[PDB]
Design an enzyme around this catalytic site. Structure first.
Site, short mmCIF file in Angstrom:
data_model
loop_
_atom_site.label_atom_id
_atom_site.label_comp_id
_atom_site.label_asym_id
_atom_site.label_seq_id
_atom_site.Cartn_x
_atom_site.Cartn_y
_atom_site.Cartn_z
N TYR A 1 111.72 -69.54 -71.46
CA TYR A 1 113.08 -69.97 -71.76
C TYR A 1 113.94 -70.02 -70.49
O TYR A 1 114.19 -68.98 -69.85
CB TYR A 1 113.70 -69.07 -72.83
CG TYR A 1 112.98 -69.04 -74.16
CD1 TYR A 1 112.00 -69.99 -74.49
CD2 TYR A 1 113.29 -68.07 -75.10
CE1 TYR A 1 111.34 -69.94 -75.71
CE2 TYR A 1 112.63 -68.01 -76.33
CZ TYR A 1 111.67 -68.94 -76.63
OH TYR A 1 111.01 -68.90 -77.84
N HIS B 1 102.61 -66.66 -76.87
CA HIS B 1 103.56 -67.72 -77.25
C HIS B 1 102.91 -68.79 -78.14
O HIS B 1 103.54 -69.29 -79.08
CB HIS B 1 104.16 -68.36 -76.00
CG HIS B 1 105.55 -68.89 -76.18
ND1 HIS B 1 106.48 -68.88 -75.17
CD2 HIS B 1 106.16 -69.46 -77.25
CE1 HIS B 1 107.60 -69.45 -75.60
NE2 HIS B 1 107.43 -69.81 -76.86
N1 LIG Z 1 107.59 -69.27 -80.58
C1 LIG Z 1 108.06 -70.47 -80.23
O1 LIG Z 1 107.29 -71.40 -79.91
C2 LIG Z 1 109.53 -70.72 -80.29
C3 LIG Z 1 110.42 -69.72 -80.47
N2 LIG Z 1 111.82 -69.95 -80.65
C4 LIG Z 1 112.76 -68.83 -80.86
O2 LIG Z 1 113.44 -69.04 -82.09
C5 LIG Z 1 114.86 -69.04 -81.86
C6 LIG Z 1 115.55 -69.90 -82.89
O3 LIG Z 1 115.19 -71.28 -82.73
P1 LIG Z 1 116.12 -72.47 -82.12
O4 LIG Z 1 115.25 -73.50 -81.52
O5 LIG Z 1 117.10 -71.85 -81.16
O6 LIG Z 1 116.96 -73.09 -83.32
P2 LIG Z 1 117.89 -72.59 -84.51
O7 LIG Z 1 117.45 -73.03 -85.86
O8 LIG Z 1 118.07 -71.09 -84.35
O9 LIG Z 1 119.31 -73.27 -84.19
C7 LIG Z 1 120.05 -73.03 -82.97
C8 LIG Z 1 121.24 -73.95 -83.04
O10 LIG Z 1 122.04 -73.63 -84.21
C9 LIG Z 1 123.39 -73.44 -83.83
N3 LIG Z 1 123.96 -72.41 -84.69
C10 LIG Z 1 123.55 -71.10 -84.78
N4 LIG Z 1 124.15 -70.42 -85.72
C11 LIG Z 1 125.02 -71.33 -86.29
C12 LIG Z 1 125.92 -71.24 -87.37
N5 LIG Z 1 126.08 -70.14 -88.11
N6 LIG Z 1 126.63 -72.35 -87.69
C13 LIG Z 1 126.45 -73.46 -86.98
N7 LIG Z 1 125.62 -73.67 -85.95
C14 LIG Z 1 124.92 -72.56 -85.65
C15 LIG Z 1 123.34 -73.07 -82.35
O11 LIG Z 1 124.55 -73.40 -81.64
P3 LIG Z 1 125.29 -72.35 -80.65
O12 LIG Z 1 124.25 -71.66 -79.79
O13 LIG Z 1 126.15 -73.19 -79.69
O14 LIG Z 1 126.02 -71.43 -81.56
C16 LIG Z 1 122.17 -73.90 -81.83
O15 LIG Z 1 122.56 -75.23 -81.49
C17 LIG Z 1 115.01 -69.42 -80.39
O16 LIG Z 1 116.24 -69.03 -79.81
C18 LIG Z 1 113.83 -68.66 -79.77
O17 LIG Z 1 114.14 -67.29 -79.58
C19 LIG Z 1 112.23 -71.25 -80.68
C20 LIG Z 1 111.44 -72.29 -80.47
C21 LIG Z 1 110.00 -72.13 -80.17
#
Ligand SMILES: NC(=O)C1=CN([C@@H]2O[C@H](COP(=O)(O)OP(=O)(O)OC[C@H]3O[C@@H](n4cnc5c(N)ncnc54)[C@H](OP(=O)(O)O)[C@@H]3O)[C@@H](O)[C@H]2O)C=CC1
EC number: 1.1.1.-
Length: 284
Positions: A55, A113
């Site tokens: 990340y 991962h």
């Molecule tokens: N093992 C793997 O291969 C992977 C692991 N991950 C992990 O999973 C986590 C979650 O996945 P991710 O891809 O980030 O996507 P998410 O489904 O968690 O969505 C993240 C987005 O949602 C927005 N958001 C969050 N909370 C709210 C809310 N209550 N209302 C409105 N908008 C909201 C954020 O904006 P803002 O930040 O501006 O609030 C951001 O744009 C990652 O952070 C990571 O730790 C992710 C992808 C791959």
């Protein structure tokens, strides 16, 4: 009502919503904001922080490191190792480098991962050595389907695996057909990533759906909160939404208090139905 928790590694009952960090550590003028977002989550009772070496090429881990200074005893810290680093020739070094950027001497949990070309046996021996040295408390995996998990269980000490982190949200239910049932049968918690589908980036009409918006409005909650509650409606599932916004963090923490009716879930089953076939494992 009973609090929504999950048995996770050595932690007997973590809250079922944690803190994602993908797309933190990218923008260096947003550091302090990101530290505050994580700190607000901890403040509001969330303990699981999920990061990875990938990340922002170590950036996320550095941000998390500053955020958890003075708070190490408040958090359940999960990071991850690229498949190509997950064997004798690179495991210790990738962990050492994660730990340094996190400014801590141990992880609560370390996850492969995704699966690459290193034999699972080698990876498991490498993880068990980190456990023995006290670098990590437990180990786990990410992006493994039912068949990969069965291969892992056939490996010596592969049953010590503590979690499987996989994509799961309302519009991507594939894991329900066979993976979640296998995980339940082996007492293995699932970490659900992209639980909001990246705020509707992974599905065109999810956040804008008509019935969903009205279901949220009647409860006084938001769409994102509705979708989080949905993810953790059954036990053994730890959602890890990412929120660099404090307003969002606080809302996500409040999603823990939402218990959706049998009416509401069946309506959601009509709009985004569960799989009727062995579907391939969705990933982002
Ligand atoms: N093992 C793997 O291969 C992977 C692991 N991950 C992990 O999973 C986590 C979650 O996945 P991710 O891809 O980030 O996507 P998410 O489904 O968690 O969505 C993240 C987005 O949602 C927005 N958001 C969050 N909370 C709210 C809310 N209550 N209302 C409105 N908008 C909201 C954020 O904006 P803002 O930040 O501006 O609030 C951001 O744009 C990652 O952070 C990571 O730790 C992710 C992808 C791959």
């Amino acid at each position: 009502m009973v609090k929504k928790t999950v048995r996770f590694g050595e932690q007997a009952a973590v809250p079922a919503i944690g803190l994602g960090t993908w797309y933190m550590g990218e923008h260096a003028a947003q550091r302090q904001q990101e530290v505050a977002a994580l700190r607000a989550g901890i403040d509001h009772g969330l303990t699981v922080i999920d990061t990875a070496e990938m990340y922002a090429d170590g950036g996320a881990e550095e941000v998390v490191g500053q955020a958890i200074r003075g708070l190490r005893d408040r958090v359940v810290l999960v990071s991850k190792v690229y498949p190509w680093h997950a064997g004798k020739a690179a495991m210790h070094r990738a962990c050492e480098n994660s730990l340094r950027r996190l400014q801590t001497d141990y992880l609560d949990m370390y996850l492969l991962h995704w699966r690459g070309d290193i034999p699972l046996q080698e990876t498991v021996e490498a993880m068990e050595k980190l456990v023995a040295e006290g670098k990590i408390r437990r180990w786990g995996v990410s992006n493994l389907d039912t068949e990969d998990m069965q291969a892992l269980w056939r490996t010596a000490d592969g049953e010590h695996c503590a979690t499987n982190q996989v994509l799961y949200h309302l519009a991507s239910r594939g894991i329900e057909y066979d993976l979640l049932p296998w995980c339940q049968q082996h007492s293995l918690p699932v970490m659900a990533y992209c639980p909001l589908a990246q705020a509707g980036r992974l599905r065109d009409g999810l956040f804008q759906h008509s019935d969903i918006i009205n279901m949220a409005n009647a409860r006084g909650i938001t769409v994102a909160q509705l979708l989080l509650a949905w993810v953790i409606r059954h036990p053994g599932v730890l959602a890890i939404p990412k929120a660099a916004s404090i307003e969002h963090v606080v809302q996500n923490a409040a999603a823990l208090d939402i218990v959706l009716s049998g009416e509401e879930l069946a309506q959601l089953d009509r709009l985004y139905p569960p799989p009727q076939r062995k579907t391939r494992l969705d990933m982002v």
